Each structure stands twice: as C-alpha cells, then as structure tokens.
Amino acid sequence: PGQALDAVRMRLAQLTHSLRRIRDEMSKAELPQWYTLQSQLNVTLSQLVSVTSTLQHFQETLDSTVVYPLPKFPTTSHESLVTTLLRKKNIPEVDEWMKYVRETSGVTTALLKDEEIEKLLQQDREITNWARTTFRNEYGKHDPFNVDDVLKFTFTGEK
Amino acid sequence: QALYEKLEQTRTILSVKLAELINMTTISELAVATTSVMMVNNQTMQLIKNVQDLLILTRSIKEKWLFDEKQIEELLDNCIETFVAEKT
C-alpha cells in the first residue's frame, strides 16, 4: 500500500523540518533578533508546506480513496487513545473557523440556485480572467587609508 | 557602491518582481483555502518587501548626503595703535 506513499512522508518530514527551526526560534525569545533574516527564513520555510501541500494534490486520489487507516497495527493498549485523537486528526476549532468560512461563505447561496446561478459563478470567474490579458498587455508597456603597514605590505603587493 | 546597484537593481527587479506575483494574485480543497491567504501574506509580504525596499531606498537616498572682534571697536582701536604706535 503506497510503495511511493512513504516518499511522500519523507517530503512531509522535509516540510515538518520547517517547523523544527521555527519553533525553537520562538523559544529563542524574548531577546530580539534579525527580523528581516528570520521573517524571511520563517516565510520561506512556510511556503514549502503548501508546496508539499501542493505535491499532495497530485496524489489527491489517495487521500480520497484515502488509502486510509487499514494502517493501525500496534495494539497500544489504551494509551494510544491520545494517539487516537492523534491518529484521529479530524477538525479542530479550525473547524470552528471553517464555519467562519461558512458564514464568510455568507450569501449566496444554495440553497440558492441550481445551476444557472452556478453557471453565472463560472461565467463570473472567467470574466475576471480576460481582464488579466488586458493587464499583462499594458504591463509590458514600461517594462582613513589603511595603516601604512598594509601599504608597505602593499609595497609587498598585499591588497 | 556597485552592490547597491546589484541588490537594489535586483530590488528594481524586485519592484519588477513585486508587481509580478502580486497583481498575479490568482483567481484542491484544503490547499485552495491555503493559497488564498498565502498571497494575502506573501503578495503583501513581498509588498512590504518592496515597501521595505521602498524605505530602504527612500531614506538610503539620504545616505547619499555624506569671534572676539568687538566689531570694529577692538578692530580699528587696535588697528591704529598698531600702525600709528608703529610710526610716530
């Protein structure tokens, strides 16, 4: 089951390693350091989570078929109940924030229309598209001197 | 400084890159909720990044900056007793 599914996990490990450094820098507070460097080094390590989040969507047929938990062997007699909410995943408040995605879903919405309203959603996106080929088309429009020693070492040639 | 040219003309390329992927703000389930604040942060990040390269280059255009006389009283009072106490 998923001979190549583990090579996806080592790429979850490469992306998880983006958390490693990040969180050990959190504790590296409260003494202040290198906002530019860290911020860019935190942002850069975040992006890849989405790009391993991306390389997962090509494999999205196996998170749908889901490949799912045939997988639990160990018999961890109870104490894996914490590995059970852990194996469990499911949705956190982030779900409480998913319905905030549902009230941001706002209206809308179905029950709203069946089709021809939807075909006015797709015909609603596609016209945002053409405004962008009018965009790229107007874009290409404008597109003290060192201590004398080193100078005597420069009389030695030294730079 | 030929390196302010190489970085801040790669920052010019960055104003060029900053208008690129931002307006580029684009039109999966879990990851297409992802990419939608991914550019609110990384389009506007890089937007405060050329906003920061706006400031860096706004105020670093600035780093391109780099008597007892007592009037004539103690002047002409001792400008006489110098020369007329010189020859007389």
């Binding site: 989570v49 997962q56 998170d63 889901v66 490949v67 995943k89 949705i91 982030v94 | 604040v37 942060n41």
Partner: peptide
C-alpha cells in the same frame, strides 16, 4: 482520509497564520 489527518495539519497552518498575523501587528 489520509486527507483528514492533513486537514488538522491545515489547522497547524492557521495557528501559524494568526500567530504570524498577530506578529504583523
């Protein structure tokens, strides 16, 4: 369903999303 273990690690993104956003202030 190997997807739902990754929707709570989508939720690992939000606490970094709002902690990165509350950093922005």
């Amino acid at each position: 369903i190997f997807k739902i273990v990754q929707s709570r690690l989508m939720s690992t993104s939000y606490h970094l999303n709002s902690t990165l956003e509350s950093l922005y202030d």
